[PDB]
Swiss-Prot record:
UniProt-reported outcome of changing residue 119 to A: Loss of activity
Protein name, entry field: Ribonuclease pancreatic
Compartments (UniProt record): Secreted
Glycan-modified residues: 1, 7, 34, 37, 41
Disulfide bond entries: 26-84, 40-95, 58-110, 65-72
Keyword match Hydrolase: yes
Binding site for substrate: 7, 10, 41-45, 66, 85
Tissue and organ expression note: Pancreas.
Oligomer status and interactors: Interacts with and forms tight 1:1 complexes with RNH1. Dimerization of two such complexes may occur. Interaction with RNH1 inhibits this protein. Monomer.
EC number of this enzyme: 4.6.1.18
GO molecular function: lyase activity; nucleic acid binding; ribonuclease A activity; RNA nuclease activity
GO cellular component: extracellular region
Length: 124
């Protein structure tokens, strides 16, 4: 099956755009990366950076994840991100999101060898 590292790239990477271009970015990206297949995922963030700079965050500032684990790392620098959150008119299978573009540090959890990101924790 799909690895955890691969799932993180499918759900959170968008190196092909520098930022969200319009209010429909979340609606199309959510559908196209298959994040609405079984149900509407309520929150999800896309990162508009090269995959090498996001993988490097596993060698940056070690911090505690929101749930207590200690395999979390925070970016020394801010990154371009898009936050997608479900709207009031969202109704499966027609999931609807609100697009929010912004610049913040990212917090991810890392695992394996090579040691890479496997989950998006938060943006701060």
């Amino acid at each position: 099956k799909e690895t955890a590292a691969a799932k993180f790239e499918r759900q959170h990477m968008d190196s092909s755009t520098s930022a969200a271009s319009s209010s429909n970015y979340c609606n199309q990206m959510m559908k196209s990366r298959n994040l609405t297949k079984d149900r509407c995922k309520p929150v999800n963030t896309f990162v508009h950076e090269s995959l090498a700079d996001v993988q490097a965050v596993c060698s940056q500032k070690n911090v505690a994840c929101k749930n207590g684990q200690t395999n979390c790392y925070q970016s020394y620098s801010t990154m371009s991100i898009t936050d997608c959150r479900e709207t009031g008119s969202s109704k499966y299978p027609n999931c609807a999101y609100k697009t929010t573009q912004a610049n913040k540090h990212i917090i991810v959890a890392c695992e394996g060898n090579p040691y890479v990101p496997v989950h998006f924790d938060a943006s701060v």
